[PDB]
Each structure stands twice: as C-alpha cells, then as structure tokens.
C-alpha cells in the first residue's frame, strides 16, 4: 500500500569505508501524531532481525554512532561510517505509520577485503555411509577471497563433472571471507571401482590450481 | 531478561492450517502488542499482522487474508497466529516481535521455519568426515537426506566456536544435504574429543557423531 523502494540491491564498501543506503516511500510517512515512524533494521545471515534506527534520525540503545539516519518526506538515508566486518547483512527500511506496515526490499552489504587463497581439504566417504549403499566424497575450500572460484573433480585422472554439488557460505561474520563446499556423490559400487580421487581449486590468487588427493587403496 | 520464544519449525501439508506460538517473558504482557513478520528465503521482510492484548484489536496485511487469525492468551501471556489453507507460497521463517504504542520492534523471537509440502519429515543421516603435519586439522560433518529445513550443527555442544563453517543446504529431489566444517590445532585431534551435534527440529531428532580417525 505505502510503497518502499530501496536502492541499491547490494552495496560493496571497503573496510573502514563509508556506506550510504537510500529508501524512498510512495507517500508521506508522517503519522497523525506528528512524528515520522521510519525505522531501519538489520538481519545478519542466520540471525533474527535487529533494530538500529527509529524515528527517522534517532539511534536505538546499543547502536554505535557510525550509524546515522536522516530523512525528509519521502526520501530517507541510512549512513554507516568506518564499516566493520560486523556490519555485514541486509538492511531494511520500515514504515510504521500506515497499516499495513511495509518493509523495503533490503540492501545487502558486501564488504571488500584483501585477497585470500583457499585452504583445501578432501574427505573420503565415511564408513557409515558406505555400509548403506552410498558414497559421497566431500571437498572444503575455506576462507578465500574474492567469491569467484572453480572446483574440478578428477577420478583416476579423468575429469568427472556430474554428481557434483556446489554451495557457498555467506560472507564470513568475522574475517569477511567466503568458504565453499563441493560434493561428488556416488553409489558405493562405482566408488569402489576406482582408486584415486582428486579435488582441484583454481582461484584468482594463483595460476596453478590447489590440488588435494587421496587414494582408496591407501 | 525480555525474550520471545517460538517453536523451532513446523512442517505443514498444503491446504492445512498452522498455529504459531510467540510467548513473552520479562515484562508486562498487555503493555506491548505482538506483531508477526514473514521473512522470505534470501530477503524480504513482510509484515503479516499484529494483536494488541490491551484493546483486543487485530490487523493483517492483505496478501494473506481470509486466512490469518491473530489471538493472544493473557492468562498464559502467549500470542498465537493461525494461518489457514496453506500453500508453498507461505513457507518462510515467521518472526514474532513486540511493540509498545508509538515504540518500535526492539525485541524479536527466534523465528519458526514453516515448510508447506506434501512430503514427510525425514531425519538426517549424520556422517563423520576425517582425512598435513605442521598443521591444524580440518574436519567435517555430513548431514544428508533430511526434510524439511532447518538443521542446527554445533561442535562440542557449542564449545567449539571458532573455525566452524556450516554450508547452506542444497535441495535436490525433495531432500536436503549440507556439510559442516571445523578446524582445530593438530595437537588437539584426535587427542581431544571433537563431536558434531546435529539437530533437526521438524523430526525432533538430535544426533551426535564423534569424529574418529
């Protein structure tokens, strides 16, 4: 009903930099008590939403002064100074003056940090998984930056690309790195028809891939 | 010690109803309304409705209605939201939060993950992941074949905080699969017990898997 247009959809900012989030309403959000019930909320990955700003420019208890809210009529701004790794998450503007209350679309704060090469670890299928017909070999690529990375699977030297599942963590709450898991899932029958299993990571950090291996015989 | 407690998760058949519970502690129940907010998978908060225990008033946003019934039990200081004839479009994490008149949503609940599907509850199969020297050991926990979301994975019942990565589950053929990574100093493993705690509230199942060489 009252509409809340939030820009941008994601916001890259350097650590210690300055961020600016815009929110814009369909109508005036001044209430029939004289005040403007414009609020700003943050939801970190995997956590419940949290209150930062209420009453366009007032700071909630416990919110640092780096967060600054301002607004006039239908245009509203949240400003975050000296951005921290703890600032990561999605920021929502919120109008609470005309029911139904409405949120903005959100702005995802992605923070820029220095490059980090992935740490690669390979794991054979568990004993418990094999004794029930299945065999997944899992490869972790942890705490790398930037986000883009490629994983290549090889079985007995030949590249294998089907049966592989990839999933990326959200940006790390603490060191703002990314981690990625890749899983090659086989039946126990095909897994025990080959010997050596290889996981190959290529990342912007290095030209030649980071390779981790094990052999089923060993 | 204000807190709002909600059920962990609810799996609902399509076309059925669900009743969400939001129970408050640490304050006078009737002095704060209880609002319900729907959170969609990647983003999007959506205000569903509210109940005022002081006046007895109700309200909902209009994408849902004929179906949202907001009540509260002041006896038991508990708010309830019933949602009728559910579709997959209602599957989300539903948060409850409190609001004093002309105040703000300062305290929120843990949230209830609601999944609308015909498929059944499936507990997860938890598999240990064991493998350099001069190193730290990276170990894992494979949580395969569960439905629905979510699962909570901890290490040493929460005592192993640092070095833990839980990867988002991937859905395929109506089954979820994820893995959890933990890194500890080589001196600690397998010397010190490292145990993986997997919890799936929809199954009401809790699994512990020691990571053994």
């Amino acid at each position: 009903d009252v509409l809340m247009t939030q820009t941008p959809l994601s916001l890259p900012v350097s650590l210690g930099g300055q961020a600016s989030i815009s929110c814009r309403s369909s109508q005036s959000v001044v209430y029939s008590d004289g005040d403007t019930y414009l609020e700003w909320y943050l939801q970190k990955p995997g956590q419940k939403p949290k209150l930062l700003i209420y009453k366009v420019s007032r700071r909630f208890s416990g919110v640092p002064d780096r967060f600054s809210g301002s607004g006039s009529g239908t245009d509203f701004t949240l400003k975050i100074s000296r951005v921290e790794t703890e600032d990561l998450g999605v920021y929502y503007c919120f109008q609470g003056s005309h029911v139904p209350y409405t949120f903005g679309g959100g702005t995802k704060l992605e923070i820029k940090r220095t490059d980090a090469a992935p740490t690669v670890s390979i794991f054979p299928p568990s004993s418990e998984q094999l004794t029930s017909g299945g065999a997944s070999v899992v490869c972790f690529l942890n705490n790398f930056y930037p986000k883009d990375i490629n994983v290549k699977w090889k079985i007995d030297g030949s590249e294998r690309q089907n049966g592989v599942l990839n999933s990326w963590t959200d940006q790390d709450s603490k060191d703002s790195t990314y981690s990625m898991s890749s899983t090659l899932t086989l039946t126990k029958d095909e897994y025990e028809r080959h010997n050596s299993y290889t996981c190959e990571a290529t990342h912007k950090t290095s030209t030649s891939p980071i390779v981790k291996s094990f052999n089923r015989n060993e | 010690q204000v807190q709002l407690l909600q059920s962990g998760a609810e799996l609902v058949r399509p076309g059925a109803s669900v009743t969400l519970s939001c129970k408050a502690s640490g304050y006078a129940f009737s002095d704060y309304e209880i609002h319900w907010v729907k959170q969609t998978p990647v983003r999007g908060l959506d205000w569903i409705g509210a109940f005022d225990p002081k006046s007895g008033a109700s309200a909902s946003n209009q994408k849902v209605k004929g179906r949202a019934i907001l009540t509260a039990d002041k006896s038991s200081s508990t708010a309830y939201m019933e949602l009728r004839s559910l579709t997959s479009e209602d599957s989300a994490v539903y948060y409850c939060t409190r609001l004093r008149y002309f105040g703000y949503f300062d305290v929120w609940g843990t949230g209830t993950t609601v999944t609308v599907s015909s498929a059944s509850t499936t507990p997860p199969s938890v598999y240990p992941l064991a493998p350099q020297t001069n190193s730290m050991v990276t170990l894992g926990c494979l949580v395969k074949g569960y439905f629905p979301e979510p699962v909570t994975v901890t290490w040493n019942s929460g005592s192993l905080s640092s070095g833990v990565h839980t990867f988002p589950a991937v859905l395929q053929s109506d089954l979820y699969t994820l893995s959890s990574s933990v890194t500890v100093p080589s001196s600690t493993w397998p010397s010190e017990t490292v145990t993986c705690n997997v919890a799936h509230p929809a199954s009401s199942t809790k699994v512990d898997k020691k990571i053994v060489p």
């Binding site: 019930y37 | 005022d52 609001l99 008149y101």
Partner: peptide, 8 residues
C-alpha cells in the same frame, strides 16, 4: 510503528 491498538 504507531501500533494497531493506539488510535482508539
């Protein structure tokens, strides 16, 4: 927000 129960 104002509150759905404050205007009366």
């Amino acid at each position: 927000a104002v509150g759905i129960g404050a205007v009366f």
